[PDB]
Structure formats: C-alpha cells, structure tokens
Amino acid sequence: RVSSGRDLNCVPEIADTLGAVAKQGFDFLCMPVFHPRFKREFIQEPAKNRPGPQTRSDLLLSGRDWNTLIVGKLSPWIRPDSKVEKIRRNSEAAMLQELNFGAYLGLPAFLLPLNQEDNTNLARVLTNHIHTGHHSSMFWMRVPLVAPEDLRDDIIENAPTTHTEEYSGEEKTWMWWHNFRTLCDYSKRIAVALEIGADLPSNHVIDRWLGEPIKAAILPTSIFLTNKKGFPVLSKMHQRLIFRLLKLEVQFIITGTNHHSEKEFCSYLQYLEYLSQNRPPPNAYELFAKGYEDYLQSPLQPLMDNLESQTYEVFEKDPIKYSQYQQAIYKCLLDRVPEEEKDTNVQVLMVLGAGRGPLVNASLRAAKQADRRIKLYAVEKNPNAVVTLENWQFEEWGSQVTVVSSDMREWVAPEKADIIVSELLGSFADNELSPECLDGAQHFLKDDGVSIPGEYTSFLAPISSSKLYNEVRACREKDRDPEAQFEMPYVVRLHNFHQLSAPQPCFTFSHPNRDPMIDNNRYCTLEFPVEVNTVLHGFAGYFETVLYQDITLSIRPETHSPGMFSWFPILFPIKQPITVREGQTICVRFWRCSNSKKVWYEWAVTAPVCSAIHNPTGRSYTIGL
Amino acid sequence: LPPNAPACMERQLEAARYRSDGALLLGASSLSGRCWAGSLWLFKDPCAAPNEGFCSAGVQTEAGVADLTWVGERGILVASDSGAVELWELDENETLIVSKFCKYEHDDIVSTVSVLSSGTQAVSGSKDICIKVWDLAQQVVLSSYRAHAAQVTCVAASPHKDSVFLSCSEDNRILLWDTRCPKPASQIGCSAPGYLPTSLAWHPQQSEVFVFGDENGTVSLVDTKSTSCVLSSAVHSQCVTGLVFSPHSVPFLASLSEDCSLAVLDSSLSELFRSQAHRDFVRDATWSPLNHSLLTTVGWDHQVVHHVVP
Ligand SMILES: CSC[C@H]1O[C@@H](n2cnc3c(N)ncnc32)[C@H](O)[C@@H]1O
Numbered sequence: 047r048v049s050s051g052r053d054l055n056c057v058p059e060i061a062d063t064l065g066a067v068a069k070q071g072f073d074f075l076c077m078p079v080f081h082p083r084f085k086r087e088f089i090q091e092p093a094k095n096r097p098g099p100q101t102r103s104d105l106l107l108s109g110r111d112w113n114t115l116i117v118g119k120l121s122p123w124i125r126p127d128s129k130v131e132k133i134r135r136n137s138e139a140a141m142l143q144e145l146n147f148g149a150y151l152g153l154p155a156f157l158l159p160l161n162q163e164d165n166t167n168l169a170r171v172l173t174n175h176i177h178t179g180h181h182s183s184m185f186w187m188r189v190p191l192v193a194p195e196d197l198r199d200d201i202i203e204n205a206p207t208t209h210t211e212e213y214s215g216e217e218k219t220w221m222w223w224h225n226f227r228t229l230c231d232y233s234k235r236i237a238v239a240l241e242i243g244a245d246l247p248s249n250h251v252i253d254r255w256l257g258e259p260i261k262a263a264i265l266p267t268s269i270f271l272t273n274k275k276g277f278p279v280l281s282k283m284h285q286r287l288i289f290r291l292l293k294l295e296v297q298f299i300i301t302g303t304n305h306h307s308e309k310e311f312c313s314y315l316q317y318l319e320y321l322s323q324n325r326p327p328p329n330a331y332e333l334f335a336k337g338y339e340d341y342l343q344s345p346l347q348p349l350m351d352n353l354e355s356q357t358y359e360v361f362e363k364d365p366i367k368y369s370q371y372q373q374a375i376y377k378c379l380l381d382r383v384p385e386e387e388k389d390t391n392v393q394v395l396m397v398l399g400a401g402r403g404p405l406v407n408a409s410l411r412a413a414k415q416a417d418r419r420i421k422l423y424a425v426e427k428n429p430n431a432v433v434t435l436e437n438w439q440f441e442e443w444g445s446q447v448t449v450v451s452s453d454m455r456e457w458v459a460p461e462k463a464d465i466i467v468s469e470l471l472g473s474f475a476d477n478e479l480s481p482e483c484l485d486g487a488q489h490f491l492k493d494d495g496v497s498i499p500g501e502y503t504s505f506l507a508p509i510s511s512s513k514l515y516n517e518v519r520a521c522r523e524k525d526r527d528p529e530a531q532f533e534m535p536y537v538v539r540l541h542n543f544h545q546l547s548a549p550q551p552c553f554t555f556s557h558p559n560r561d562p563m564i565d566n567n568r569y570c571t572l573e574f575p576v577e578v579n580t581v582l583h584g585f586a587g588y589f590e591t592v593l594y595q596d597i598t599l600s601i602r603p604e605t606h607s608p609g610m611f612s613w614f615p616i617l618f619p620i621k622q623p624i625t626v627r628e629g630q631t632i633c634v635r636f637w638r639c640s641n642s643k644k645v646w647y648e649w650a651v652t653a654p655v656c657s658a659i660h661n662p663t664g665r666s667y668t669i670g671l
Numbered sequence: 672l673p674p675n676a677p678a679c680m681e682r683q684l685e686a687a688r689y690r691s692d693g694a695l696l697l698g699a700s701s702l703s704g705r706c707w708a709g710s711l712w713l714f715k716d717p718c719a720a721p722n723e724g725f726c727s728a729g730v731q732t733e734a735g736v737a738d739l740t741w742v743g744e745r746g747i748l749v750a751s752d753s754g755a756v757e758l759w760e761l762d763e764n765e766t767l768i769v770s771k772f773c774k775y776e777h778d779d780i781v782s783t784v785s786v787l788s789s790g791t792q793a794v795s796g797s798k799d800i801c802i803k804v805w806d807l808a809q810q811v812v813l814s815s816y817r818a819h820a821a822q823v824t825c826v827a828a829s830p831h832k833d834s835v836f837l838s839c840s841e842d843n844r845i846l847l848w849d850t851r852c853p854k855p856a857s858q859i860g861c862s863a864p865g866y867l868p869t870s871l872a873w874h875p876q877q878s879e880v881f882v883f884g885d886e887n888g889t890v891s892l893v894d895t896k897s898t899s900c901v902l903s904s905a906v907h908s909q910c911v912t913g914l915v916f917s918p919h920s921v922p923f924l925a926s927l928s929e930d931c932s933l934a935v936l937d938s939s940l941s942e943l944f945r946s947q948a949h950r951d952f953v954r955d956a957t958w959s960p961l962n963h964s965l966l967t968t969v970g971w972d973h974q975v976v977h978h979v980v981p
C-alpha cells in the first residue's frame with residue numbers, strides 16, 4: 047500500500063531493533079553505520095591510533111538484510127564545510143569512511159544533510175565517492191521544507207525573528223538543494239528526502255519541489271495533531287501535501303519518539319495507510335498510464351515506418367476517440383444528404399490511413415445511425431495492415447469497401463470524394479506529417495468536399511523537471527553527437543514535473559487547404575509569463591483537433607478529451623537548464639521546416655536568456671516524407 | 672561486582688563526578704561493537720576505579736550516556752541517545768541503583784544536562800535543537816524552548832539562581848536565559864561572531880561571570896554586565912569539550928579537549944599544569960572534595976587518572 051521506514055539515531059542491538067520496527071509494519075530502517083557520538087581523529091596522535099573495532103560487524107545482518115532493509119546515515123559530527131581546517135580534514139576522511147562502509151555492506155541508500163547554505167566541500171567529497179567504483183546505491187539528501195533558523199521561536203530578546211515577507215528567503219531551502227545538485231552535475235543517484243516541518247511554508251515554496259527528484263518524505267512525530275480519542279492525526283492542509291506526495295509515489299519516513307505514548311508506532315503508520323486507502327481510485331487513463339510515468343519513448347512515424355500488429359491493437363483499444371470520429375461523420379452525412387435525397391444520394395467516403403479498420407468500422411456505424419448510403423475506400427500504405435483489411439473486406443465489409451493498398455499521395459482515385467477521414471495525428475498534432483499527407487490527397491476531393499479532421503492545432507507549455515532533464519541526458523548513444531538526445535522530441539507521461547505557464551497554441555492547419563501557395567513551414571514566437579523562481583528544462587506539447595463542427599479531440603490538460611489515453615504528451619528538451627525568476631517571461635520560438643525528403647522542428651529560448659538553436663537543419667531529428 | 676553491578680564497564684566513560692563525601696559517579700557508553708548501550712557505577716574509594724572489582728555499586732542503561740548529573744546525594748539524571756531523560760535512585764545502604772523515572776520527550780539524542788539551584792528542576796540539551804524544563808518531582812516538562820537553529824551542545828545552570836542558565840549551540844549562538852522575561856533567552860557573544868561554542872562553565876563566586884571554550888581550543892572569559900569578552904587564551908590544539916572550576920577560595924579552571932590533553936588555568940587564564948596522561952578522548956572532570964588539590968579525569972581510553980595540581 048504505502049512503503050515506509052523508521053529513522054532512529056540510537057541502536058543498541060541491530061538484531062532486537064530491526065524485528066521491532068518490522069513488527070510495527072516498517073519496510074525499512076534508517077540508522078547510523080558508526081555511532082553518531084563516536085567521533086574519530088585521522089591525523090593527530092594519540093587518538094588517531096585509537097584501537098578498533100571502529101563499528102559493529104556486517105555479519106550481524108544478512109547481505110540480503112543490508113541490501114533491502116537498511117538506509118545508512120552520515121554521523122552528525124561530520125561537517126566537511128567547517129570554518130576550521132582540522133574539522134574539515136577529519137570530516138572529509140570520516141565521510142569517505144562512512145560512505146565507503148555503506149557500499150561495503152551494499153546498502154540501497156545513504157542519508158546526508160543539507161541543513162546549512164554552503165555545502166560545497168560536502169558535494170565535492172560525495173562526487174569523488176561517486177566517481178570511485180560503479181555502484182547504484184542512491185544518496186538521499188535531507189533538506190527541510192523550512193530552514194531550522196526560520197522556524198525558531200521568537201524568544202530571543204536581542205535577535206528577534208523578522209516578520210517581513212521573505213518570498214525569496216522562504217525558498218532558501220530549495221537553493222541549498224539546487225546548488226548541491228548542480229555542483230554534482232545532476233547524478234541520478236542524488237535525490238531528495240524532504241523533511242516536513244511543524245508549520246508548512248507558503249504554497250509557492252511547496253510549488254518549488256514539484257518536479258525535483260524526491261524519493262523520501264520525512265515526517266517527525268512533532269507535526270501530529272491528537273484527535274479526541276488520542277489518535278495521531280495531521281492538519282487538513284498537511285493531508286493535501288501527503289495526498290500530493292502519494293501521487294508522486296514517495297517513501298514516507300518517521301523520525302522522533304512516540305509522543306502518542308498510549309499507542310504503538312503503528313498509530314502513525316496507520317494514518318498514512320488510512321489516508322492512502324481513502325484517496326480516490328485510479329481512473330481509466332490512470333490505469334492505462336500505469337508504468338509509463340516519466341518514461342521517454344521515441345515519437346511514432348507511421349509514415350516512414352509500418353506500425354506493428356500490437357501497436358495498432360492497443361491504439362484501437364481507445365473507445366472514446368472512435369465514438370468522436372463516428373459522431374463527426376454521423377453529423378456530416380445528415381448535413382450533406384437531405385432526407386428526401388436519402389436513397390437518391392450515396393456519399394463517397396475515403397479513410398486515408400486505415401490501419402486495421404476501426405475508423406472504417408466507425409464509418410459503418412455512422413451510416414447505420416444516420417441512415418444514408420456511403421461508398422467506402424480504405425487507403426493504407428503498410429501492406430501488413432492491408433492484410434487485416436482485405437481479410438475483413440472479404441469476410442464482413444464486402445464490395446461496399448474497396449481496399450486501396452497505397453500512399454494517399456500516390457493513389458490516382460477512380461472518383462473524387464464527399465468526405466476524407468484520417469487519424470494521421472501525433473502528440474504535437476502535425477508531427478506524423480498529417481498536413482503533407484492530406485495536402486497530397488486533396489486533389490481527389492470534390493470542391494464541396496469535407497475533411498475529418500477539418501483542423502488541428504499544437505500547444506506548448508514551459509516545464510521544470512530535473513528528473514526528465516536527467517532522463518533525457520541519459521539517452522546519449524555512442525557513434526552519435528553527444529547532445530543529439532537534447533535536440534529531439536520524446537512522448538512521455540509527464541509526472542514528476544512543474545508546468546511554469548499555461549499552454550499557448552503553436553501551429554494550426556486546416557483541411558482542405560484551398561491556399562493558392564500551400565506552405566506547411568512555420569515560425570512562431572511565444573511568451574510564457576512565469577510567477578515562481580524555477581528552472582526550465584523543456585517545453586511540453588499537446589494538441590487539439592476539430593473532427594467536424596463541435597466534435598473535437600484534445601490532450602490539452604485544460605480541455606482534455608476525458609478518458610482518451612491514445613496520446614501521451616510530447617517533450618521538447620533543452621541542452622542547458624535556464625534559471626527563471628518570478629515576474630519573468632519565458633520566450634520560446636518554434637520552426638517547422640521541410641525538405642522534399644523530411645520535415646523537422648527547430649526551437650530556441652530567446653528570454654529571459656538565449657538558448658542555442660536546437661535541431662538546426664534537422665541534424666539530430668527529422669520525420670521522413 | 673556488587674549486586675545488579677555487571678562485570679565489564681563500557682570502554683567509553685563519558686562522566687566523572689565526585690560527591691561531597693568523595694564517592695565517584697561514573698557513567699559510560701558503548702560507542703563501538705555490537706551492543707551500543709550505557710552503564711552507571713559507584714566508587715566509595717576514589718583510586719579503586721576503573722576496576723569494577725573494588726566498586727561499591729553499578730547498573731546498565733538501555734542506551735548510551737552522552738551526559739549525567741548528580742541530584743544531591745541519592746539521585747542521578749541521564750542524557751540518553753534514546754531521546755529520553757531518566758532518573759535512577761541510589762540504595763539506602765547504596766548497594767544498588769534502580770530507575771526512578773525514564774521519559775522519552777526529546778526527538779533526537781540528548782547531548783547535555785544541568786540541575787537548577789533548587790535541585791527540584793533541571794534543563795536538557797538535545798540534537799532535536801530543543802531545550803526543555805523538567806519537574807524532577809512531577810517527572811514532566813513544563814517548558815519547551817526552540818531558541819537555537821542547530822543542535823544544542825551545552826546547557827549550564829546558574830549556580831545561584833533557579834531561573835538563569837547558559838546554552839551554547841552549533842548555530843554559533845551562546846544564550847543567557849531568564850525563564851521570568853517573556854522572551855526568556857538573550858544572545859551573548861564577543862565583538863564579532865566566531866568559532867563554535869563547545870564548553871560552558873559558570874563562575875562559582877561571581878554569578879555575573881562565565882567561561883566558554885570554542886571548537887578552536889581558545890577558552891574565553893565572559894562578563895555578562897558589560898556583555899563583552901575581556902580575555903581568551905589558546906590552550907588546546909582541538910575542541911574544548913569541558914571546563915570545570917576547582918572548589919578552591921580563588922578557584923582553578925580545568926580545561927579538557929579532544930587533543931587528549933588537560934591543563935588547569937589560574938584566574939588570569941594562565942596554564943599552571945599540562946598532562947598528556949590520557950591516550951584517548953578526555954570527557955569529564957571532578958575535583959577531590961577531600962584533597963582539594965586532587966583532580967579526577969576519565970576518557971574513552973577506559974583510563975581514570977587522579978591529578979596532583981600545583
Ligand atoms: C492509424 S495510424 C495512421 C495509419 O495511416 C497509415 N498512413 C500514414 N500515412 C499514410 C499515407 N501517406 N498513405 C497511406 N497510409 C498512410 C499508416 O500506415 C497507419 O496505419
């Protein structure tokens with residue numbers, strides 16, 4: 047249900063303790079690998095030659111035990127960033143030793159604190175440990191939502207707390223993390239353990255951490271209200287947060303003595319399980335998108351490639367989209383053939399990009415509903431799918447359906463069409479080259495001819511996600527430009543992320559394109575107003591299309607076609623994250639460019655600073671014509 | 672070994688305190704090996720320690736012992752890593768030590784303790800950064816102070832006042848306290864903010880005077896009236912862990928450090944004695960009540976040294 051651990055700074059017997067925590071329901075333990083008061087000297091006799099053992103043995107637990115159930119904790123005395131040489135040297139050596147021992151034991155994670163501003167030497171030292179051996183043992187950074195110093199009680203007469211607004215100042219805790227992380231070049235092994243305090247900060251501060259790499263929420267017993275019956279409980283507002291964090295799937299930790307003394311530690315844990323099971327069920331979308339959270343996939347090119355069987359299978363498992371397609375045609379027919387003309391007028395209906403025939407099937411359900419006569423073509427270039435179609439037409443569709451196995455740009459039609467219908471649309475609307483495909487097929491439309499869809503429009507929104515920025519960076523491949531990853535779109539269920547501004551339209555296309563000089567090449571400038579301090583990693587993409595009149599589809603989260611899981615959002619990354627400040631505008635520029643051969647996007651951020659132009663000349667990414 | 676008195680004393684002896692009668696209270700923890708816990712002991716003979724064979728009484732605590740205090744002649748108050756403060760009662764014939772009260776009120780290790788001029792109340796320093804006010808009699812916590820922004824290092828009660836105690840923390844703050852004022856805590860430091868405060872000792876005679884030892888091994892001389900640091904000396908190569916005043920007319924100040932050295936200082940901060948006898952971390956100091964010129968030093972080396980001060 048909810049993975050959870052118990053932090054403790056005192057373990058007499060690792061044997062005794064571990065059973066207890068597990069008895070109470072704790073999945074894991076966070077504890078010191080060396081005694082937290084046990085301070086060591088590494089340079090000065092006599093205490094340098096202190097006789098061993100320097101801690102308890104690995105033998106005391108199974109390798110399996112260490113691998114699964116223990117999270118190490120840096121001893122609190124270790125202050126690499128001390129003003130005093132002797133302490134800095136000794137903490138350098140001690141941090142290495144402790145961290146080295148974590149890895150000796152194969153511990154899955156190790157807790158280090160960001161409890162002050164300057165953590166430069168600490169980062170330096172960890173970075174060294176990381177570049178020593180190849181391990182996967184995560185490092186959890188302990189950072190508070192609120193600095194201990196801005197949570198003191200105002201009981202110091204000579205040095206009172208400043209009750210002035212500190213917008214920038216109450217985000218200090220994030221700057222701590224941001225810097226440490228940046229010094230460490232965004233190692234995927236360095237994540238956040240976010241200590242939640244008594245008093246939650248201003249929502250803006252919590253808004254910072256949305257797209258940060260948080261593996262842990264730390265909850266001290268100190269933040270627990272007591273219900274009438276003496277149960278441990280949390281503020282209404284703390285609940286909203288815990289609900290948010292469950293969505294981000296984090297591992298809730300518990301620190302502090304059992305204040306609710308007339309109860310087991312299970313009391314605390316029970317509340318979380320209680321909140322968890324009380325959360326709304328996963329919707330249909332949420333079920334489909336289960337494992338694909340922040341999973342980067344290459345965008346499909348069903349023009350230059352032929353889609354697999356199972357690709358078409360799943361994509362047809364979207365009932366809503368075909369309902370919408372059926373309805374658009376239903377309405378178009380009634381609007382094209384008067385009831386007096388019903389049996390005198392049969393309509394020429396050409397599906398351009400048929401795949402395995404759900405749209406053809408819906409074209410059929412449209413006629414039976416609207417009771418008019420329809421002549422069917424199924425044009426499809428993937429000759430594998432054409433196999434499924436000609437197997438259907440033979441068995442069920444009969445001579446109503448002429449299967450045409452070709453490119454719609456090739457096929458010389460026996461007759462012009464009343465209606466053309468297509469599902470040639472990517473997550474950025476036009477990224478599969480729906481415009482070029484339907485431009486080439488438009489000659490075989492009657493002058494009064496309709497296209498479904500009549501129109502589509504891309505939208506773009508600036509986002510912050512150090513997690514997706516890291517995931518993209520990870521997509522480097524040998525024998526290719528070391529930064530090709532950054533110059534290409536990815537379809538992804540954006541999850542651990544922060545949208546910095548609501549979407550704006552990017553590119554629009556209308557079919558038929560009666561334009562005298564049709565050009566699908568585009569240059570667009572966008573200005574996105576941002577109102578928190580944040581760091582831009584890339585631009586999300588969605589789309590909206592008009593099938594016919596009021597019938598439409600959208601993956602735009604505000605206008606989202608509900609239940610429709612057929613398209614995940616698109617991501618245009620940038621090579622270098624761009625610091626943005628409250629007030630500032632993010633200006634992005636997008637170009638759609640074409641060849642005879644290929645179509646591509648280029649993009650640049652022109653404010654608040656300039657980025658390098660991305661995918662220049664389609665060098666890193668193109669779409670085949 | 673007397674009754675309820677185990678064989679072994681944990682190697683890491685954190686506390687060395689002499690009663691009026693010249694009895695020796697030793698608390699010690701296990702900072703190494705499989706069992707990470709603490710002990711309590713009694714030496715009705717001074718020089719019998721550290722051998723448990725000659726000890727008059729002893730017991731074992733659940734957890735280690737970061738700091739311990741006398742509560743007159745019978746009671747002993749503990750700073751337990753467990754995050755609990757606990758009181759144990761001494762025997763009528765003083766043969767045994769039994770736990771009076773054990774309350775887990777701190778959320779992290781309990782680092783320091785001192786008992787009030789009354790001896791009916793005490794104050795605790797924890798790495799949860801909080802300082803608490805205790806009713807020894809009622810065994811509860813009337814006040815919680817979160818003055819500091821870092822873990823609390825030392826809490827020293829005023830000798831002569833039940834409302835006044837010093838506190839030093841890693842937040843580079845030293846606090847003078849008066850429970851009476853609505854903002855009790857009052858920040859006191861030298862001219863410029865400096866190295867961290869590590870050790871606190873109130874002057875026995877002049878209740879306007881205290882001393883602090885920094886992490887840099889500079890002991891400092893503090894007058895609250897002018898609230899300005901008059902004098903400081905470079906005594907120790909390392910952090911000053913402890914500062915103890917002799918019972919003498921004009922007292923002597925004992926300076927102990929992680930440099931595994933001890934010195935005794937005159938009233939003008941001038942070092943009369945330098946002892947390298949300890950081979951590990953010098954934790955605590957008490958002066959011989961009987962022979963006032965004798966000093967009793969413990970450390971993690973499990974060594975108990977007795978000192979002839981010039
Ligand atoms: C339903 S995903 C789009 C479908 O249309 C087909 N398609 C895409 N472009 C063309 C084209 N130019 N001519 C014919 N079929 C196409 C693809 O092979 C795929 O099955």
Ligand SMILES: [Cl-]
Pocket residue numbers: 537611612613614
């Ligand atoms: Cl998808």
